[PDB]
Structure formats: structure tokens, C-alpha cells
């Protein structure tokens, strides 16, 4: 075509953990604080090269506040992969990963790809979720995991490529 592969990605997680920030960093290599919140669902496209193959990613960026969940869930079953984000400075956000994974269990395709991302890892002072606490949890579910900083670009690119490769492998 004009792309070798077409993958659909979903960002999922509590409000304000940084899902839009991560997406805008991956799609435009910018970080700004001059955007209103995500109302409903946002959408960005980016192409990557992997194993020489051109891959077109279609990333849906959901709103994470509770009331939005029912609208949000309608987008799961389309996705090739779902990224669950939490804020590493915010304990309650990590605690909620369990439910989000239940949402994936309830709504997404039975063998969708799951990645876990711990954002705002540049705020080291206020950091409350340690790598080992998260890794071990992710390990227990066969889920890949990275800490990232949309602000510093730290592991943002790596995240999506890992997700991509993981889907690629699956087909």
C-alpha cells in the first residue's frame, strides 16, 4: 500500500497521569502545557519503521475520569494494543491499574496486546511508585513495562515501538 502494517492503539488510565502528553510527544516530539483536557476521545497518527517494515499506528487517546468510562469502553474492542498509564507520583493512579486491566478483560479483544507505562518519572522528589513495585506486578501478568517522561522524552519512543513489535510478532 503506502504502509506495510496498520495497527490500532489505545491509551487508557486515570485522568492526568499524562496520556495525552505521551501521545503528543510520540507524534510531534513536543511537550506543552497549553491544552485543555481530553473530552471523550482524541486521535493521532504516526508512522514508524520496524524490521525494515513501515508501520502506521492509529492511536486513540481516551478521557480517564470515571463518568467517561462507558463512552471510552466502546473503543477497546477495535484495538491491536492497549497502553495502561499511571502517574508514578500518584499512588491512587497505580492502584487503579487493576481495574483498567479488568476493563481490557471486559471490553478489548481476547488476545489484545497490553503495555504498562509509569509516567512523570522525571519528578523524582514526589515519586511514590518504585520501579520494582510496578515491574513485579507487570511481570506477574506477562505485561511489558516502562517508566516514562513525556516532558523529557525519556522512554516515550521506546514504549510505542515495544508495543508495535509486540503486535507485529503476534501477526
Amino acid at each position: 500500500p503506502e504502509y506495510d502494517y496498520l495497527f490500532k492503539l489505545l491509551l487508557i488510565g486515570d485522568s492526568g497521569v499524562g496520556k495525552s502528553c505521551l501521545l503528543l510527544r510520540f507524534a510531534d516530539d513536543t511537550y506543552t502545557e497549553s491544552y485543555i483536557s481530553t473530552i471523550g476521545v482524541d486521535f493521532k497518527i504516526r508512522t514508524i519503521e520496524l524490521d525494515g517494515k513501515t508501520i502506521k499506528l492509529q492511536i486513540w487517546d481516551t478521557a480517564g475520569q470515571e463518568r467517561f468510562r462507558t463512552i471510552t469502553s466502546s473503543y477497546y474492542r477495535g484495538a491491536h494494543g492497549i497502553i495502561v498509564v499511571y502517574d508514578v507520583t500518584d499512588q491512587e493512579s497505580f492502584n487503579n491499574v487493576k481495574q483498567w486491566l479488568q476493563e481490557i478483560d471486559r471490553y478489548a479483544s481476547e488476545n489484545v496486546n497490553k503495555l504498562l507505562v509509569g509516567n512523570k518519572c522525571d519528578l523524582t522528589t514526589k515519586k511514590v511508585v518504585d520501579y520494582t513495585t510496578a515491574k513485579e506486578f507487570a511481570d506477574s501478568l506477562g505485561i511489558p513495562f516502562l517508566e516514562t517522561s513525556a516532558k523529557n522524552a525519556t522512554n516515550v519512543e521506546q514504549s510505542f515501538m515495544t508495543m508495535a513489535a509486540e503486535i507485529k510478532k503476534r501477526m
Partner: protein, 351 residues
Amino acid sequence: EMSCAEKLLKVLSFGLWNPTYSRSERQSFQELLTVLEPVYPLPNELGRVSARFSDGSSLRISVTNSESIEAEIRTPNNEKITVLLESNEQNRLLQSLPIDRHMPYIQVHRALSEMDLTDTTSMRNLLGFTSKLSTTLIPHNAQTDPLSGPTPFSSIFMDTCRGLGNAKLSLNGVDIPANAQMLLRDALGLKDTHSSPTRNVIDHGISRHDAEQIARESSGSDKQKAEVVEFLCHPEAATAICSAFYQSFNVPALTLTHERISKASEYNAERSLDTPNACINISISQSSDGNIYVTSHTGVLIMAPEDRPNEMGMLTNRTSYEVPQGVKCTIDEMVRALQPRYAASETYLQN
């Protein structure tokens, strides 16, 4: 010779979308029409609207629940004329006021100029227009109710941080620009996205000095500026501001429409059009009785039903509510005091 309040009142009666108006006249009207702000309605009023122009003339329109319309002109020489207005099909008067109606169908407007949705400024401007036109009210049930569920309002402070400096915001008709909104951001104690407002503001409101600084940086009349300072010094002014940004106000309306909104998001992301996801336009007024009314708008791009395919317009959600006295800026306190009323409209570029 003829005042602003009067000019506009001629227009609304002849009709905003009347075909006999040259395009250069339509722009000169949208300039007059944007002075219109919603305000606290009295007990029998379906909605009340107010405009205070720079030529010193004001205008107060009120629509009763029986949909009867009454305007009041105040000339720059303080004369008090009172007109009875009739809305019908050639004027669409009722449609060109910021009022929530009980229609059997969501209202559909046509943009008055070439607001071709390419970028941010296009979108904001269109929302600038739609914020002043009518909307159809939408009921919610327990599941789509923004205030129901296990954690209502949990996101307002985050929403407030992201919104301030990125919204179009008016208090008592005074436009508070980005710089000022950013001072107000810091004035609430919401310096960083992870904080709550200070125990001092929650209790006593913004400090007098902060308020005066914000009102100096703002565009608007000198008398009006003073009302803004007095508004900001209230514990309830913090409540009004923060709540107006609540993201889930938009849930009743999207429930009816999101698939079409997403369609527009994709359509645009494919053409590399750098169009924001959502725009916010807030309008808050304190009556000369102390009554605080919030009217909060969210505009969002939307695709026409599959009857006029590939046509794109804007979906506008209006949230109106009173902030009663003594309702301090707290999530727990907002959830039990505030009683929002959600409403929407679809606007498409006549193009």
C-alpha cells in the same frame, strides 16, 4: 446616532441569519452579539441575557418559561425603554440568544462566516460564535449524570490547571485574557497540576491584591473591572471558576454523539490539520444581588449525520448552574450543592 444596544436589538428582530445582510454587516453583528452574556435568571425565566457595550448602552433580554421575550434598552443617557420581542421563523430570534430550550430536537445553527476549521484560532472563534446561540437541553440518567457515580468532580483541579490560560473566559462581561487567567491560576494556589487550592482561598477567597492584579491585566470597562475585583474576593468565586472546567459535564451530550466526533477527529488527523481536541468558553456573572451564575461551553468538532457526508461542524455543550452562597471550593462540597443543567447544539459552516 443609534446606540449599540439598539443596533443589536434591530438585528435580532429582523433576524441574525437574514439573507438581505451583506457579509460585511454579518461580521459587524457577530461583534455586537458576543457582548451578550448569560446571567442568573429570575424564578419564572427560562434564561436571562445581558449586554453592556462600550458606548455606555446596555441591553437586558429575558425569556420566560412560556417562551415570551422581553428586552430592556438602556441608552447611554440612562433612558429605560422596554420592548416586547416576538420570535418566529424569519428572525429565529430565540435561536440567537444564549438560552437553553426544551426542544424536541437538538438545535442546528449555521455559522455566519467562513470559519474554515483548519487550526486553533478557527475553532476558538467558531466556539466564540456558538456560545451565543441557543441550545437544546439534554436529560441524563444515573449512568450519564456527570455528578453521579463513585468519584464525581475528581478531576476539576487538574481540569482547572489545564484550562486556565487556554480558555476564553469572562467575568461580569470582562474578558480575562491568557496572562490574567494564568495569574488566576496561581491566585487559587493551583500552581502545579497535582495540587488543590489553598486553605485560605477555600475559606476567604482570593486575596484582594491578587484580584486587583488580575483585573488590571484584563480587557474591559473601568466600572466593570471593579465588579471583577469584588467578585474574586468571595469564597464562592473560587468554586465557580474551578467547577466550570469539569470535563464530564460533556458526558450527557457525547453519549448521544461521540462516534461522529471521533469520525471528525480521524478525518482531520489524516489531513495533518492541527486542530485542538476541544475548546472551552466560560462565562460567569454575579448579579447585583450576589447571585453567581456559571455558563460553561465546550466546543468540539463533529461530522454531519450520514445524509450530508464529508461535511464537518461543531458540537457545543452548554452547562449552566448557580453557585449558591457559602458553597466553598471543595470537591465534596460541589457534589452536594451544585445542580448543573446540560444542553447542546450542532453548528455547521454555511459553506
